[PDB]
Enzyme design. Sequence first.
Site, short mmCIF file in Angstrom:
data_model
loop_
_atom_site.label_atom_id
_atom_site.label_comp_id
_atom_site.label_asym_id
_atom_site.label_seq_id
_atom_site.Cartn_x
_atom_site.Cartn_y
_atom_site.Cartn_z
N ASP A 35 0.84 -1.20 0.00
CA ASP A 35 0.00 0.00 0.00
C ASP A 35 0.87 1.25 0.00
O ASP A 35 1.37 1.65 1.05
CB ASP A 35 -0.88 -0.03 1.24
CG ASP A 35 -1.78 1.17 1.35
OD1 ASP A 35 -1.90 1.92 0.37
OD2 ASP A 35 -2.39 1.33 2.42
N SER A 199 -0.95 15.63 -11.88
CA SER A 199 -1.22 15.28 -13.26
C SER A 199 -1.49 16.54 -14.07
O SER A 199 -2.03 17.53 -13.56
CB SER A 199 -2.42 14.33 -13.33
OG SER A 199 -2.85 14.08 -14.64
#
EC number: 3.4.23.22
Length: 330
Positions: A35, A199
Amino acid sequence: STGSATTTPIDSLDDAYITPVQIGTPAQTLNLDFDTGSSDLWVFSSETTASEVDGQTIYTPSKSTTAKLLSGATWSISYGDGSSSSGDVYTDTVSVGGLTVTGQAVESAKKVSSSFTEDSTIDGLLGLAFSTLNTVSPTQQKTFFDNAKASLDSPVFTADLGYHAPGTYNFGFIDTTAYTGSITYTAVSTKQGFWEWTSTGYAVGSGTFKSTSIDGIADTGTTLLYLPATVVSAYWAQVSGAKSSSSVGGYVFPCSATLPSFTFGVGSARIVIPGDYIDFGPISTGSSSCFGGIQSSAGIGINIFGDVALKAAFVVFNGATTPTLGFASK
Protein backbone atom coordinates in the site's frame (compact mmCIF):
# COMPACT_ATOMS: atom_id res chain seq x y z
CA SER A 1 20.74 -5.65 -3.32
CA THR A 2 17.42 -6.04 -5.10
CA GLY A 3 14.12 -7.85 -4.66
CA SER A 4 11.40 -8.92 -7.06
CA ALA A 5 8.00 -10.37 -6.10
CA THR A 6 4.87 -11.24 -8.03
CA THR A 7 1.67 -9.53 -6.96
CA THR A 8 -1.64 -11.27 -7.64
CA PRO A 9 -5.22 -9.93 -7.77
CA ILE A 10 -7.34 -11.21 -4.89
CA ASP A 11 -10.44 -11.67 -7.07
CA SER A 12 -11.77 -11.40 -10.62
CA LEU A 13 -12.26 -7.61 -10.32
CA ASP A 14 -8.70 -6.70 -9.19
CA ASP A 15 -10.15 -5.33 -5.95
CA ALA A 16 -6.67 -5.56 -4.42
CA TYR A 17 -3.35 -7.29 -4.99
CA ILE A 18 -1.48 -9.60 -2.62
CA THR A 19 2.27 -10.21 -2.52
CA PRO A 20 3.94 -12.97 -0.50
CA VAL A 21 6.19 -11.76 2.32
CA GLN A 22 8.48 -13.90 4.49
CA ILE A 23 8.44 -12.96 8.17
CA GLY A 24 10.55 -14.49 10.91
CA THR A 25 12.79 -17.50 11.33
CA PRO A 26 11.87 -20.01 10.05
CA ALA A 27 9.96 -17.97 7.53
CA GLN A 28 6.23 -17.52 7.94
CA THR A 29 4.85 -16.47 4.56
CA LEU A 30 1.91 -14.06 4.65
CA ASN A 31 0.16 -12.49 1.66
CA LEU A 32 0.19 -8.74 2.21
CA ASP A 33 -1.46 -5.82 0.45
CA PHE A 34 1.38 -3.49 -0.60
CA ASP A 35 0.00 0.00 0.00
CA THR A 36 1.80 3.13 -1.23
CA GLY A 37 -0.82 5.18 0.63
CA SER A 38 0.12 4.07 4.14
CA SER A 39 3.21 3.38 6.19
CA ASP A 40 2.50 0.48 8.58
CA LEU A 41 3.47 -3.15 8.05
CA TRP A 42 0.78 -4.93 10.04
CA VAL A 43 -0.33 -8.56 10.09
CA PHE A 44 -2.98 -10.89 11.34
CA SER A 45 -1.34 -12.75 14.17
CA SER A 46 -1.65 -15.24 16.98
CA GLU A 47 -2.65 -12.19 19.07
CA THR A 48 -5.62 -11.22 16.89
CA THR A 49 -9.00 -11.63 18.60
CA ALA A 50 -10.07 -15.11 17.51
CA SER A 51 -13.54 -14.07 16.34
CA GLU A 52 -11.91 -11.51 14.01
CA VAL A 53 -9.84 -14.11 12.13
CA ASP A 54 -11.69 -15.89 9.32
CA GLY A 55 -9.29 -17.78 7.05
CA GLN A 56 -6.27 -15.45 7.07
CA THR A 57 -2.78 -16.77 7.61
CA ILE A 58 -1.38 -15.49 10.89
CA TYR A 59 2.06 -14.50 12.10
CA THR A 60 2.99 -16.25 15.36
CA PRO A 61 5.98 -14.38 16.83
CA SER A 62 6.56 -16.99 19.53
CA LYS A 63 7.54 -19.42 16.74
CA SER A 64 10.11 -17.02 15.24
CA THR A 65 13.56 -17.20 16.79
CA THR A 66 14.34 -13.69 15.51
CA ALA A 67 11.19 -11.97 16.78
CA LYS A 68 11.59 -9.49 19.61
CA LEU A 69 8.76 -7.61 21.30
CA LEU A 70 9.27 -3.87 20.85
CA SER A 71 8.63 -2.98 24.46
CA GLY A 72 5.83 -0.49 25.06
CA ALA A 73 5.05 0.05 21.39
CA THR A 74 1.49 0.08 20.11
CA TRP A 75 -0.13 1.02 16.84
CA SER A 76 -3.59 2.00 15.64
CA ILE A 77 -4.61 2.94 12.12
CA SER A 78 -7.74 4.05 10.29
CA TYR A 79 -7.89 3.95 6.50
CA GLY A 80 -9.73 6.12 4.00
CA ASP A 81 -12.40 3.45 3.47
CA GLY A 82 -13.33 3.45 7.17
CA SER A 83 -11.48 0.26 8.11
CA SER A 84 -9.07 0.06 11.03
CA SER A 85 -6.77 -2.18 13.06
CA SER A 86 -4.52 -1.94 16.11
CA GLY A 87 -2.11 -3.90 18.26
CA ASP A 88 1.46 -4.26 19.51
CA VAL A 89 4.79 -4.45 17.74
CA TYR A 90 7.62 -6.90 17.18
CA THR A 91 10.84 -6.52 15.28
CA ASP A 92 11.71 -9.42 13.02
CA THR A 93 13.39 -10.32 9.75
CA VAL A 94 11.22 -9.58 6.73
CA SER A 95 11.99 -10.59 3.14
CA VAL A 96 10.22 -9.62 -0.08
CA GLY A 97 11.20 -11.29 -3.30
CA GLY A 98 14.69 -12.10 -2.04
CA LEU A 99 15.36 -8.71 -0.38
CA THR A 100 15.84 -9.04 3.37
CA VAL A 101 15.51 -6.42 6.12
CA THR A 102 16.49 -7.31 9.65
CA GLY A 103 14.85 -5.53 12.56
CA GLN A 104 11.74 -4.54 10.62
CA ALA A 105 8.82 -3.40 12.74
CA VAL A 106 6.06 -5.99 12.29
CA GLU A 107 2.85 -4.63 13.76
CA SER A 108 0.83 -7.50 15.20
CA ALA A 109 -2.93 -6.97 15.16
CA LYS A 110 -4.87 -7.47 18.34
CA LYS A 111 -8.02 -6.06 16.69
CA VAL A 112 -9.08 -5.61 13.08
CA SER A 113 -12.27 -4.10 11.70
CA SER A 114 -14.92 -6.20 10.00
CA SER A 115 -13.79 -5.48 6.44
CA PHE A 116 -10.43 -7.11 7.17
CA THR A 117 -11.98 -10.14 8.88
CA GLU A 118 -14.32 -10.59 5.94
CA ASP A 119 -11.47 -10.68 3.41
CA SER A 120 -9.76 -14.02 3.89
CA THR A 121 -7.23 -13.33 1.10
CA ILE A 122 -5.37 -10.43 2.77
CA ASP A 123 -3.15 -11.30 5.73
CA GLY A 124 -2.09 -7.71 6.42
CA LEU A 125 -0.66 -4.59 4.81
CA LEU A 126 2.86 -3.52 3.86
CA GLY A 127 2.97 0.26 3.78
CA LEU A 128 5.13 2.00 1.19
CA ALA A 129 4.27 5.67 1.81
CA PHE A 130 6.65 7.89 3.76
CA SER A 131 7.60 6.82 7.27
CA THR A 132 6.25 10.09 8.72
CA LEU A 133 2.78 8.44 8.51
CA ASN A 134 3.75 5.37 10.54
CA THR A 135 1.42 5.02 13.53
CA VAL A 136 3.67 3.23 16.04
CA SER A 137 3.77 5.01 19.38
CA PRO A 138 5.71 6.22 21.28
CA THR A 139 8.57 5.61 18.80
CA GLN A 140 7.59 5.86 15.15
CA GLN A 141 8.95 3.07 12.97
CA LYS A 142 10.32 2.93 9.42
CA THR A 143 8.73 1.26 6.44
CA PHE A 144 10.26 -1.78 4.79
CA PHE A 145 11.43 0.39 1.90
CA ASP A 146 13.00 2.97 4.20
CA ASN A 147 14.88 0.23 6.05
CA ALA A 148 16.04 -1.40 2.81
CA LYS A 149 16.86 1.66 0.71
CA ALA A 150 20.50 2.19 1.75
CA SER A 151 21.25 -1.42 0.75
CA LEU A 152 19.45 -1.29 -2.58
CA ASP A 153 21.33 -0.90 -5.83
CA SER A 154 19.18 2.18 -6.48
CA PRO A 155 16.77 3.74 -3.93
CA VAL A 156 13.62 2.90 -5.87
CA PHE A 157 10.76 0.47 -6.06
CA THR A 158 8.43 -0.13 -8.98
CA ALA A 159 4.79 -1.18 -9.24
CA ASP A 160 3.70 -3.09 -12.34
CA LEU A 161 0.13 -4.13 -11.55
CA GLY A 162 -1.72 -6.42 -13.95
CA TYR A 163 -5.21 -6.09 -15.39
CA HIS A 164 -6.97 -9.31 -14.43
CA ALA A 165 -3.52 -10.87 -14.16
CA PRO A 166 -0.48 -10.98 -11.87
CA GLY A 167 2.13 -8.23 -11.91
CA THR A 168 5.37 -7.36 -10.15
CA TYR A 169 6.85 -5.25 -7.38
CA ASN A 170 10.59 -4.69 -7.81
CA PHE A 171 12.95 -3.14 -5.26
CA GLY A 172 16.27 -1.55 -6.11
CA PHE A 173 16.19 -1.65 -9.91
CA ILE A 174 14.17 -0.60 -12.94
CA ASP A 175 13.35 -3.50 -15.30
CA THR A 176 13.78 -1.81 -18.67
CA THR A 177 11.98 -4.72 -20.38
CA ALA A 178 8.76 -4.11 -18.41
CA TYR A 179 7.55 -0.96 -20.19
CA THR A 180 7.36 0.63 -23.63
CA GLY A 181 8.77 4.00 -24.61
CA SER A 182 10.31 6.15 -21.90
CA ILE A 183 9.55 6.77 -18.24
CA THR A 184 8.35 10.32 -17.58
CA TYR A 185 9.29 11.56 -14.14
CA THR A 186 7.29 14.12 -12.21
CA ALA A 187 7.73 15.99 -8.95
CA VAL A 188 6.49 14.66 -5.62
CA SER A 189 5.41 16.49 -2.48
CA THR A 190 5.95 14.53 0.73
CA LYS A 191 4.24 17.18 2.88
CA GLN A 192 1.26 14.90 3.61
CA GLY A 193 3.36 11.72 3.77
CA PHE A 194 2.09 10.44 0.41
CA TRP A 195 3.51 10.01 -3.08
CA GLU A 196 1.66 13.16 -4.04
CA TRP A 197 2.06 14.56 -7.56
CA THR A 198 0.23 16.74 -10.09
CA SER A 199 -1.22 15.28 -13.26
CA THR A 200 -1.26 17.65 -16.23
CA GLY A 201 -4.82 16.80 -17.34
CA TYR A 202 -7.09 14.23 -18.90
CA ALA A 203 -9.04 13.04 -21.91
CA VAL A 204 -12.18 10.92 -22.20
CA GLY A 205 -12.12 8.33 -24.97
CA SER A 206 -10.97 9.85 -28.24
CA GLY A 207 -11.82 13.35 -27.01
CA THR A 208 -9.47 16.31 -26.82
CA PHE A 209 -7.00 16.48 -23.95
CA LYS A 210 -7.93 19.00 -21.25
CA SER A 211 -4.83 20.61 -19.76
CA THR A 212 -5.51 21.13 -16.07
CA SER A 213 -3.53 20.44 -12.90
CA ILE A 214 -4.88 17.54 -10.83
CA ASP A 215 -3.04 17.03 -7.54
CA GLY A 216 -3.36 13.51 -6.19
CA ILE A 217 -1.61 10.52 -4.69
CA ALA A 218 -0.26 7.32 -6.25
CA ASP A 219 -1.96 4.72 -4.04
CA THR A 220 -1.61 1.01 -4.76
CA GLY A 221 -3.82 0.30 -1.73
CA THR A 222 -6.90 1.98 -3.22
CA THR A 223 -8.84 0.06 -5.87
CA LEU A 224 -10.38 2.88 -7.87
CA LEU A 225 -9.49 6.22 -9.47
CA TYR A 226 -10.92 9.14 -7.48
CA LEU A 227 -10.90 12.48 -9.29
CA PRO A 228 -12.66 15.85 -9.08
CA ALA A 229 -16.40 15.79 -9.67
CA THR A 230 -16.07 17.84 -12.87
CA VAL A 231 -13.69 15.29 -14.43
CA VAL A 232 -15.75 12.31 -13.30
CA SER A 233 -18.97 13.84 -14.67
CA ALA A 234 -17.26 14.45 -18.02
CA TYR A 235 -16.24 10.78 -18.16
CA TRP A 236 -19.60 9.25 -17.26
CA ALA A 237 -21.49 11.62 -19.57
CA GLN A 238 -19.98 9.57 -22.41
CA VAL A 239 -21.66 6.36 -21.14
CA SER A 240 -25.34 6.16 -22.01
CA GLY A 241 -27.42 5.51 -18.93
CA ALA A 242 -24.63 6.10 -16.42
CA LYS A 243 -25.59 8.08 -13.35
CA SER A 244 -24.44 8.83 -9.84
CA SER A 245 -26.44 6.78 -7.35
CA SER A 246 -26.51 8.06 -3.79
CA SER A 247 -27.90 4.73 -2.60
CA VAL A 248 -25.15 2.66 -4.22
CA GLY A 249 -22.43 5.18 -3.38
CA GLY A 250 -21.16 6.42 -6.72
CA TYR A 251 -21.47 6.22 -10.45
CA VAL A 252 -23.13 3.13 -11.88
CA PHE A 253 -23.66 2.24 -15.50
CA PRO A 254 -25.55 -0.34 -17.55
CA CYS A 255 -23.61 -3.58 -17.69
CA SER A 256 -24.38 -3.68 -21.43
CA ALA A 257 -22.32 -0.53 -22.04
CA THR A 258 -18.93 -0.36 -23.74
CA LEU A 259 -16.83 2.00 -21.63
CA PRO A 260 -14.54 4.64 -23.16
CA SER A 261 -10.91 4.88 -22.20
CA PHE A 262 -9.60 7.55 -19.82
CA THR A 263 -6.25 9.27 -20.38
CA PHE A 264 -4.28 11.10 -17.70
CA GLY A 265 -1.28 13.36 -18.22
CA VAL A 266 2.17 12.92 -16.69
CA GLY A 267 4.06 15.98 -17.83
CA SER A 268 3.83 15.91 -21.60
CA ALA A 269 3.26 12.13 -21.58
CA ARG A 270 -0.10 10.36 -21.57
CA ILE A 271 -1.23 7.16 -19.83
CA VAL A 272 -4.30 5.52 -21.36
CA ILE A 273 -6.61 3.49 -19.10
CA PRO A 274 -8.64 1.16 -21.35
CA GLY A 275 -12.39 1.26 -20.85
CA ASP A 276 -12.48 -2.33 -19.62
CA TYR A 277 -10.29 -1.37 -16.64
CA ILE A 278 -13.12 0.92 -15.45
CA ASP A 279 -15.71 -1.87 -15.17
CA PHE A 280 -16.14 -3.17 -11.61
CA GLY A 281 -19.05 -5.43 -12.39
CA PRO A 282 -22.59 -5.80 -11.05
CA ILE A 283 -23.40 -3.80 -7.94
CA SER A 284 -24.92 -7.02 -6.51
CA THR A 285 -24.97 -10.54 -7.88
CA GLY A 286 -27.20 -10.77 -10.94
CA SER A 287 -27.75 -7.01 -11.29
CA SER A 288 -27.50 -5.32 -14.68
CA SER A 289 -26.22 -2.16 -12.99
CA CYS A 290 -22.42 -2.10 -12.86
CA PHE A 291 -20.12 -0.11 -10.59
CA GLY A 292 -17.77 2.40 -12.15
CA GLY A 293 -14.02 2.45 -11.64
CA ILE A 294 -13.73 6.25 -11.81
CA GLN A 295 -15.47 7.98 -8.93
CA SER A 296 -15.61 11.44 -7.40
CA SER A 297 -13.07 12.44 -4.76
CA ALA A 298 -15.31 15.27 -3.54
CA GLY A 299 -16.00 13.52 -0.22
CA ILE A 300 -12.37 12.41 0.35
CA GLY A 301 -10.34 15.62 0.42
CA ILE A 302 -7.67 14.32 -1.98
CA ASN A 303 -7.59 12.83 -5.46
CA ILE A 304 -6.39 9.24 -5.56
CA PHE A 305 -4.65 7.53 -8.48
CA GLY A 306 -5.52 4.04 -7.29
CA ASP A 307 -5.12 0.69 -8.98
CA VAL A 308 -7.42 1.55 -11.92
CA ALA A 309 -4.91 4.19 -13.00
CA LEU A 310 -1.68 2.60 -11.80
CA LYS A 311 -2.31 -0.77 -13.51
CA ALA A 312 -2.27 1.03 -16.87
CA ALA A 313 1.35 2.04 -16.24
CA PHE A 314 4.77 0.96 -15.09
CA VAL A 315 5.27 3.16 -12.04
CA VAL A 316 8.58 4.14 -10.46
CA PHE A 317 8.59 5.23 -6.82
CA ASN A 318 11.95 7.03 -6.68
CA GLY A 319 13.05 7.39 -3.05
CA ALA A 320 16.11 9.53 -3.70
CA THR A 321 16.81 12.43 -1.37
CA THR A 322 14.27 14.40 -3.40
CA PRO A 323 11.66 11.76 -4.29
CA THR A 324 9.99 11.66 -7.68
CA LEU A 325 7.48 9.45 -9.49
CA GLY A 326 7.92 7.95 -12.93
CA PHE A 327 5.23 6.63 -15.28
CA ALA A 328 5.64 4.65 -18.49
CA SER A 329 3.14 2.96 -20.76
CA LYS A 330 3.44 -0.81 -21.02
